[PDB]
Subunit: 93 residues, 4 copies
Amino acid sequence: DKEFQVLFVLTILTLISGTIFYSTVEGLRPIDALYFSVVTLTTVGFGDFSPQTDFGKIFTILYIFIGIGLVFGFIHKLAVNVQLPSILSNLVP
Amino acid sequence: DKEFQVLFVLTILTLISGTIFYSTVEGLRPIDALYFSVVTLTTVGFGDFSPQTDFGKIFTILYIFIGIGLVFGFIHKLAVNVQLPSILSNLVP
Amino acid sequence: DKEFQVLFVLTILTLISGTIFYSTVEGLRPIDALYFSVVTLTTVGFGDFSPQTDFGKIFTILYIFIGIGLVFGFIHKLAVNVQLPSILSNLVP
Amino acid sequence: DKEFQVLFVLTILTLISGTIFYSTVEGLRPIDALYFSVVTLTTVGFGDFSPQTDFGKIFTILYIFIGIGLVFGFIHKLAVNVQLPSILSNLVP
Ligand SMILES: [K+]
Ligand SMILES: [K+]
Ligand SMILES: [K+]
Ligand SMILES: [K+]
């Protein structure tokens, strides 16, 4: 759970950075910037938002390489250290 | 296989929740809501459907973080506990 | 390598099924059907092609769940049993 | 770290090949070609750029199968051999 808290914090910080970047450089509303950051790093990539400027494209390349690892790290421990135990506890006779 | 049944149920429940959410808040036909939920959680993300409302964007962020884990959990055991054995059995001299 | 050949065959068969399905039901040229099948199962999902009919949407949900496992299985052994050794061999003093 | 350097080089080479291919055959500006290559191999797939020619579609199928493995290989060691240690070092009393 201490591991989970660190991943949670790191993930929050990563998403804040994307929110601030895309809101500024790509002109997105903050909520659309956050949404886009999440859709990007979880590799869903709907493409309803995508960077139009070269600065945005370049940041996006780096953001993906740096962020995918910890976002999926976080997701994995969420699933294994949080969701898994609660599901098991729901089953117990 | 008992593990497989729990993942199957959990996956069904997750997809039902997305179906109901997107049908209501985003106004999708139920079938398009289900399809979109699956396209989202499996991280394919075609983007033919994507949330237009802030409520939908916010739900989508959370749905992704919560759902990716069990959807890929389910997929993994489907592949390893169901598809794998049947493929092996097809090969046997 | 025998494992690699089975995954290769299974992957080919999966892509043929998608090629035939999308060419017929969704009216795609065979090459676009194959391309779309690959873009779908590798979870890239550009969305330049996406199913427009309910039959296509329903097939796509099932195709994703069934196909992701073996496509990524194949990719993983391609990377570990084929690409890895060749890269190592290129390095050897 | 020697492993990390090899993956880094291999990833660079893979992205250069995509940059050159899409710039030429699909007529993209080099920066858009690089961006698209990364968006493709990391499986984000926004679809703002996607191949329009059959040559491009065929290359893309092969590029995905060959490139996903080493791109995710690189990402994984970046996360585990580079980001992980630095994060731990930031925590130390
Ligand atoms: K993906
Ligand atoms: K995707
Ligand atoms: K897309
Ligand atoms: K996508």
